[PDB]
Design an enzyme around this catalytic site. Sequence first.
Site, mmCIF file in Angstrom:
data_model
loop_
_atom_site.group_PDB
_atom_site.id
_atom_site.type_symbol
_atom_site.label_atom_id
_atom_site.label_comp_id
_atom_site.label_asym_id
_atom_site.label_seq_id
_atom_site.Cartn_x
_atom_site.Cartn_y
_atom_site.Cartn_z
ATOM 1 N N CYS B 9 0.827 -1.194 0.000
ATOM 2 C CA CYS B 9 0.000 0.000 0.000
ATOM 3 C C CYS B 9 0.874 1.262 0.000
ATOM 4 O O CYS B 9 1.633 1.459 0.965
ATOM 5 C CB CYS B 9 -0.880 -0.031 1.261
ATOM 6 S SG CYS B 9 -1.816 1.477 1.540
ATOM 7 N N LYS B 36 -9.449 -8.465 5.227
ATOM 8 C CA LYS B 36 -9.319 -7.511 6.327
ATOM 9 C C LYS B 36 -9.925 -8.036 7.621
ATOM 10 O O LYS B 36 -10.960 -8.711 7.608
ATOM 11 C CB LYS B 36 -10.040 -6.222 5.990
ATOM 12 C CG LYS B 36 -9.491 -5.550 4.800
ATOM 13 C CD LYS B 36 -10.581 -4.494 4.382
ATOM 14 C CE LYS B 36 -10.147 -3.735 3.179
ATOM 15 N NZ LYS B 36 -11.355 -2.895 2.780
ATOM 16 N N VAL B 49 -6.263 0.657 5.257
ATOM 17 C CA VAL B 49 -4.967 0.965 5.862
ATOM 18 C C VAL B 49 -4.366 2.186 5.163
ATOM 19 O O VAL B 49 -4.698 2.463 4.009
ATOM 20 C CB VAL B 49 -3.981 -0.246 5.743
ATOM 21 C CG1 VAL B 49 -4.485 -1.336 6.643
ATOM 22 C CG2 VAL B 49 -3.843 -0.699 4.284
ATOM 23 N N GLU B 61 -5.947 8.002 7.751
ATOM 24 C CA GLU B 61 -5.526 8.967 6.741
ATOM 25 C C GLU B 61 -4.044 9.237 6.877
ATOM 26 O O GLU B 61 -3.546 9.901 7.805
ATOM 27 C CB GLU B 61 -6.325 10.270 6.869
ATOM 28 C CG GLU B 61 -6.116 11.223 5.699
ATOM 29 C CD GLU B 61 -6.598 10.709 4.363
ATOM 30 O OE1 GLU B 61 -7.289 9.688 4.308
ATOM 31 O OE2 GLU B 61 -6.343 11.451 3.377
ATOM 32 N N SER B 62 -3.288 8.663 5.936
ATOM 33 C CA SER B 62 -1.820 8.669 5.995
ATOM 34 C C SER B 62 -1.195 10.026 6.277
ATOM 35 O O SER B 62 -0.295 10.089 7.146
ATOM 36 C CB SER B 62 -1.254 8.026 4.717
ATOM 37 O OG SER B 62 -1.574 8.775 3.533
HETATM 38 N N1 LIG Z 1 -6.768 8.434 1.926
HETATM 39 C C1 LIG Z 1 -6.169 7.181 2.471
HETATM 40 C C2 LIG Z 1 -6.067 6.095 1.391
HETATM 41 C C3 LIG Z 1 -5.702 4.715 1.950
HETATM 42 C C4 LIG Z 1 -5.966 3.641 0.913
HETATM 43 O O1 LIG Z 1 -6.366 3.864 -0.208
HETATM 44 N N2 LIG Z 1 -5.637 2.376 1.376
HETATM 45 C C5 LIG Z 1 -5.877 1.233 0.495
HETATM 46 C C6 LIG Z 1 -4.686 0.375 0.232
HETATM 47 S S1 LIG Z 1 -3.313 1.243 -0.474
HETATM 48 C C7 LIG Z 1 -6.884 0.361 1.202
HETATM 49 O O2 LIG Z 1 -6.936 0.102 2.393
HETATM 50 N N3 LIG Z 1 -7.797 -0.310 0.286
HETATM 51 C C8 LIG Z 1 -8.839 -1.191 0.782
HETATM 52 C C9 LIG Z 1 -10.153 -0.586 0.397
HETATM 53 O O3 LIG Z 1 -10.323 0.580 -0.100
HETATM 54 O O4 LIG Z 1 -11.150 -1.311 0.619
HETATM 55 C C10 LIG Z 1 -4.879 7.481 3.143
HETATM 56 O O5 LIG Z 1 -4.186 8.399 2.667
HETATM 57 O O6 LIG Z 1 -4.510 6.796 4.130
#
Ligand SMILES: N[C@@H](CCC(=O)N[C@@H](CS)C(=O)NCC(=O)O)C(=O)O
Lengths: 197, 197
Positions: B9, B36, B49, B61-62
Amino acid sequence: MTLYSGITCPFSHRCRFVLYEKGMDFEIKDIDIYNKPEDLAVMNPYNQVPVLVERDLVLHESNIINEYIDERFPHPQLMPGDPVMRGRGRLVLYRMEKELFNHVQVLENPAAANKEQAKAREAIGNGLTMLSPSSKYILGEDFSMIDVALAPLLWRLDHYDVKLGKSAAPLLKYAERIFQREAFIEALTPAEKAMRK
Amino acid sequence: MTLYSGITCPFSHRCRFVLYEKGMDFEIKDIDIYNKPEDLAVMNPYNQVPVLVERDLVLHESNIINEYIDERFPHPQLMPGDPVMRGRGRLVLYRMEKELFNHVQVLENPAAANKEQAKAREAIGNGLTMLSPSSKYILGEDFSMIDVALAPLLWRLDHYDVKLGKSAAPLLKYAERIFQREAFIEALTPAEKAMRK
Ligand SMILES: N[C@@H](CCC(=O)N[C@@H](CS)C(=O)NCC(=O)O)C(=O)O
Ligand SMILES: N[C@@H](CCC(=O)N[C@@H](CS)C(=O)NCC(=O)O)C(=O)O
Ligand SMILES: [Ca+2]
Ligand SMILES: [Ca+2]
Ligand SMILES: [Ca+2]
Ligand SMILES: [Ca+2]
């Protein structure tokens, strides 16, 4: 320091509220969103208000402008000092942007469908109703930038025809406390005063 | 302090990069995004995540997690001290989220159409090409959180099949400097090491 502001814009309203809470010297330039000057798009590639200019610094995005103002004029502090509370508050801001203010943009968009606007109005009422239980101010017993970011939406519930559940009485009592703040009243434009008493 | 992280990710990668730059004690828990645990949705209503937990604090939120980390473990500072540069940097972060990382989410979405993913790949190449001219690091001569936020995308240009213009040579030389940082290498998972040399 110059704020480019729309007289009915809730996002501009947030920045006006911060500026009056800090009490420093600033200028407001009113932008008619129906007749934007060409320089708006040079300052902001999204061609929206608000924009803040101070010397060579140009910022858009209301919550980012407000972070800047809070750091630039430290006192009075509009955020807690504790990194934990600051992180929790920044996340509350992010979730309000994604879950409440996205709907506000739909209600503000003259081009949005009636059906879209009805869904937005519904979602805001439901969202605010659920938030109502979760202290004197949103982060605790101290007023903060988080209260600032939400206040223009609460001012506009009648304007937007948003109806809340009776369980949301606590949220409405809270909103009245925010609206009694001297700087909140100073920050209202005459057009926003027309939106409720 | 515990980070819930996906091994491929890019958003988790940002937080791993910050954690290794700060050098403090933390734990990583790997989450398979295809399987998950139910507690992911209790911690994060978006069921994604990364998530950071420290005692009673839960953040998602990263970029918000990374702000917290920067404030929680002050040294070394990953942001400038100057409110002007901090505001400019926060706006650069916001524009990357809205104009680059929105496309990254499409490329990461297994359910997105081939056509959607082709448009995303194209938009990232075009966006990065245009950004390439605009110093040693993104904000100036000092490494910052802004570099951290962009680095996982630049690591993935081959993985994503993103092709940049020849004019973007400066961006690629910059990316190599970021990838030589000790903490960048420490932060890579074995799966991310498989994405390029
Ligand atoms: N805006 C979020 C994006 C996080 C994101 O897109 N995570 C993805 C993996 S890279 C995730 O958990 N995908 C599973 C889903 O959307 O169901 C951040 O910046 O943390
Ligand atoms: N994300 C922006 C939203 C600003 C926004 O939506 N401004 C509206 C007026 S309230 C605008 O300028 N509309 C003109 C347009 O979108 O063309 C912020 O928080 O500052
Ligand atoms: Ca009404
Ligand atoms: Ca009220
Ligand atoms: Ca490739
Ligand atoms: Ca490179």
